């Protein structure tokens with residue numbers, strides 16, 4: 001299978017034609033996506049198979065082939081880029097200054113950008129190109145617009 | 157049955173389209189991973 005670092009589309013044939021159900025990040029031989037994209041199912045890369053290794057429905061994260069690798073963090077100050085990968089459209093960077101999810105357990109960065117649900121799993125980058133989390137789990141606000149957490153896993 | 161296709165490199169791109177606001181929101185997180193607005 002293709003183990004090259006980078007951003008990937010997650011596709012299903014189970015519906016009409018080929019449908020993009022989301023996006024993930026290949027890094028250090030591990031595929032990283034959101035749980036709601038795959039529901040923990042196996043994946044194909046060519047005629048290689050990726051099996052789930054870790055996941056958590058509450059964090060809404062899942063790693064394939066190995067443990068979660070992405071440990072970079074929003075610094076709470078600087079702008080970031082959503083590397084958006086929309087269905088049937090080219091990878092596009094969209095630069096933004098994150099907002100905040102205030103929770104009983106702590107503050108999380110949030111990015112306010114509207115894309116189809118199939119863009120779930122698109123990585124969020126710091127100025128050094130490091131993935132500080134994945135886009136696609138969040139809320140709809142008093143306007144009808146989407147706001148996503150910067151969702152990051154833990155490394156061990 | 158689900159498959160992956162490469163879409164690109166993970167790079168910061170000088171002079172990308174700069175957009176979006178920065179809302180400060182009060183949210184709850186349930187056991188099922190659903191965020192919701194508190195007020």
Ligand SMILES: CN(C)Cc1nc(CNc2cc(Cl)cc(C(=O)NC(C)(C)CO)c2)cs1
Pocket residue numbers: 036060113114115116117118119120121135136137138140144145146148188189190191
């Ligand atoms: C609650 N978690 C645990 C499971 C689920 N989370 C989702 C969220 N999907 C999603 C992702 C993204 Cl990146 C955008 C949208 C979205 O609706 N965006 C517009 C512009 C408002 C409409 O296209 C929806 C699905 S199930």
